[PDB]
Amino acid sequence: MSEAPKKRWYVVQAFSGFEGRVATSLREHIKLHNMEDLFGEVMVPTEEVVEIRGGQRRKSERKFFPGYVLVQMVMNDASWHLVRSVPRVMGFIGGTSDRPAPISDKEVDAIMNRLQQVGDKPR
Template sequence: MAEEGLWYVVHTYSGYENKVAQNLETLVENRRLHDLIQEVKVPTEIVPEIKDGVKREVERKLFPGYVLVKMVMTDDSWYVVRNTRGVTGFVGPSSKPIPLTQAEVDALGVETHEAQVDYKVGDNVEVTAGPLEGFIGLVEEIDMEKQKVKVKVSMFGRETSAELDLSQVKPL
């Protein structure tokens, strides 16, 4: 079983993020380094942009000049990443790479964890987090792609629908 890698932040020349990610993936493929360098990401977001009076959705880099790499840190993996064209170094004090903490990884939304759903539409669930914590609700809809669940709760004598993360509810 291969060792689980940690996420590191790699600094690149501005505008070279996608090229660096592509070069790294090619190197991993060619040198069969899958167990050392497990994932390469350039975090992006979709934002609306108005150009010439036309609104359209564009993909924008969240951290220009940076690439996230999930890897097992060894002399070999460090050397491969450090010497990839366009890479200027790892983020960390005195060129010593420091992995992201699990809290940082979660906050960045780099890894998506598939939530286990052991309830179905029509089941009663308890809300375990957020402003509705402690409420009991009826599952109306489950969206696995967005990792959301729509729950109808009774508040102040009224039925109210709320969209929650799958991790915010548990079956009764």
């Protein structure tokens, strides 16, 4: 009851077309295995370019990077097994397969500002 560090973000490689499905699958595993405290949220980037005409109309869903997703966790081998056991997804990315490396928070809040800048005043 002494380890309370900056709760970490890692990256998970997801196949194309399942990104929301991967997010809701991790949410389902969190709510099923009942370690909702050990696990956190998932920050997948979304932006909305809107065009009235030209094929797709009134909306166009694009994102910064489709191949990867950012997920909130702590360091735990049980969490590692839980993430790996999720279907329709590959797993972590890092220096070594056993323990992925974290991500510097400077570009984290930079991309937070980026999504805040792009995403504002809906419709």
